């Protein structure tokens, strides 16, 4: 996104405001992020800079996020040589993803001095540097970089500043001259000709189908500041750029300020992605446990198929006790009839009595019975766990962070893990009603028990796994009855499933019997389907 084009746009459009901006205050809220509260054009404004590699940028934010309690070294060094400054001029560094502030300020003796603040936004190896005007000597540096990387340039203070090697790219037909359009995949190699390029921009321009026209038109657009700062969302993966989206299916939201675009982008992505990392790291573990339990019961089942001789021994003991008068002590076999009048030949111990033998058959029946009962109990345990984790994964798929924070504690309580009234969440409903729900099992149970009566109605899935939701004393019309089905089908084991039946039942028959093993009676069921955010 942050191409040389976006850069150059910002260069002019911020000099629009901050000609000679008086740097009133300096702070460094986060590691690779710095705030200036500047006074320009008779107004105070915020100026965020970021060398944070993926989020490295520059911005002006209405959200002065948080000035730190600690003044760090870099912040204080900026205070030393820039505080109370004066932003004479801004420059674009020749359209590379780099910017320059030509700044003035009085030294410790009131003699006016100048400096060149450089902001190189390269991606993973962005940086912020401060330099002398005439000497070009570096004075400060955010990411000191020693030449063990055997690189062209160097960061360290005192040294003469140097810029990166500017590649051999014509920064602004010439592509049809230089590049052989037969090459294909030219969205790659427009980077090989132009300076300010994203593969996003290159692809969206190449998809306009010989297309020098698109390049020239868009370059004129940017040069004229004719762009439209919007954010694009191609099924998630929210992207943004000066130009709108060109072809893809993604949603678009437009803005008046690129600065507000950056605000509304990064203000979430700072932590949304962290929460996603946590969620996925947890989901992996949960799936490992559920998969493990499934394979465990597979082991138990395929083991069970080899010790199942119970009924034979039962029937044998029955027959022997029935025929305990024809039988010698010392015999090997017994031609015996079943009480269908087959004739079975039961083996014996030629040393034992028939009483002893029959009792041994009863003993073996007892034993096989016991072992099978054990295995069936273990099966029940494992299947309960598997269903618990399957519902859990459904919830985690249809989750919010507010419920994920509760789910973590639920599992730490279950001791699968290790390291207060907000329960429910609701939206609009039919009949101008409110329908509350909880993606967390614990919050759902809290709502079902403590937030409603017995005669109220609970609406959930009529199927394997889904959430639990209801309105406070849910006794509204069939409109609300069918509206609850949409909310049920949305947050279910199969979202967007157009054949999902919802079960509506009186809370008086809601079984509060692992956790969330809630059975139900006094129930009816209606085939329904998922819906949109209009379900809110």
């Amino acid at each position: 996104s942050f191409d040389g084009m976006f850069t150059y746009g910002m260069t002019h459009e911020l000099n629009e405001k901050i000609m000679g901006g008086r740097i009133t205050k300096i702070h460094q809220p986060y590691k690779h992020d710095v705030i200036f509260h500047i006074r320009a054009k008779g107004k105070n404004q915020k100026l965020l800079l970021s060398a944070h590699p993926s989020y490295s940028r520059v911005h002006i934010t209405a959200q002065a996020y948080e000035n730190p309690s600690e003044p760090p070294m870099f912040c204080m060094l900026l205070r030393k040589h820039i505080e109370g400054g004066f932003i004479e001029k801004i420059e674009q560094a020749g359209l590379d993803r780099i910017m320059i502030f030509h700044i003035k300020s009085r030294n410790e003796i009131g003699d006016e001095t100048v400096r060149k603040l450089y902001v190189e936004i390269m991606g993973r190896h962005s940086n912020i540097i401060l330099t002398d005007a005439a000497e070009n000597v570096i004075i400060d540096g955010l990411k000191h970089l020693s030449p063990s990387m055997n690189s062209y340039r160097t960061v360290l203070p005192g040294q003469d500043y140097k810029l990166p090697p500017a590649q051999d790219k014509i920064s602004p037909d010439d592509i049809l001259r230089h590049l052989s359009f037969q090459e294909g995949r030219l969205d790659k190699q427009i980077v090989d000709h132009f300076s300010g390029v994203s593969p996003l921009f290159a692809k969206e321009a190449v998809h306009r189908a010989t297309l020098p026209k698109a390049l020239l038109a868009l370059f004129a657009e940017v040069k004229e500041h004719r762009f439209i700062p919007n954010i694009t969302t191609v099924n998630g993966k929210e992207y943004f750029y000066l130009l709108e989206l060109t072809h893809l299916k993604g949603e678009a939201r437009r803005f008046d300020s690129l600065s507000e675009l950056l605000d509304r982008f990064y203000f979430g992505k700072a932590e949304r992605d962290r929460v996603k990392q946590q969620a996925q790291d947890l989901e992996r573990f949960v799936v490992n446990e559920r998969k493990k339990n499934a394979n465990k019961i597979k082991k138990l089942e395929k083991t069970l198929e080899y010790s199942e001789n119970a009924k034979e021994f039962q029937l044998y003991g029955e027959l022997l006790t029935a025929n305990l008068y024809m039988l010698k002590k010392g015999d090997k076999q017994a031609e015996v009839i079943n009480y269908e009048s087959p004739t079975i030949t039961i083996p014996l111990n030629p040393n034992k009595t028939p009483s002893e033998n029959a009792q041994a058959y009863f003993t073996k029946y007892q034993k096989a019975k016991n072992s099978v009962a054990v295995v069936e109990e273990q099966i029940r345990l494992a299947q309960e766990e598997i269903e618990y984790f399957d519902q859990l994964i459904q919830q985690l798929s249809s989750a919010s962070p507010r419920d994920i924070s509760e789910i973590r504690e639920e599992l730490v309580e279950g001791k699968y893990l290790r390291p207060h009234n907000p329960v429910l969440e609701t939206y609009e409903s039919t009949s101008g009603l409110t329908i509350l729900v909880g993606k967390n099992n614990r919050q759902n149970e809290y709502l079902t028990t403590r937030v409603a009566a017995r005669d109220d109605i609970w609406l959930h899935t009529k199927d394997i796994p889904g959430s639990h939701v209801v309105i406070r004393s849910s006794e509204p019309d069939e409109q609300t009855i069918m509206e609850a089905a949409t909310i049920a089908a949305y947050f279910s084991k199969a979202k967007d499933s157009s054949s999902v039946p919802v079960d509506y039942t009186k809370i008086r028959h809601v079984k509060k019997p692992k956790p969330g093993f809630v059975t139900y009676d006094s129930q009816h069921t209606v085939f329904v389907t998922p819906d949109a955010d209009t379900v809110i």
Partner: protein
């Protein structure tokens, strides 16, 4: 202290192993004298170094062991680069 330890704490070289490796190659020197990883150092020392062809000359200002990141480079100063 020792050269390799000094290089690691000053973050010239990221691994003491690599410091030892280069000193054993003898790519570097001190005060015009070829040196080794066990070579003693101190403030005021003038250090010649190589990175392939990139030759470097630096000056030693301080030395320690706790050496957090940005405070590392305070330990010394660049002087000159050749090739």
């Amino acid at each position: 202290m020792r050269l390799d330890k000094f290089l690691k704490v000053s973050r010239l070289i990221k691994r003491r192993t690599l410091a030892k490796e280069v000193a054993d190659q003898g790519r570097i020197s001190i005060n015009g004298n070829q040196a080794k990883a066990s070579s003693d150092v101190k403030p005021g020392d003038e250090l010649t170094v190589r990175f392939g062809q990139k030759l470097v000359t630096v000056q030693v200002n301080e030395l320690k062991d706790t050496t957090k990141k940005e405070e590392a480079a305070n330990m010394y100063t660049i002087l000159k680069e050749e090739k």
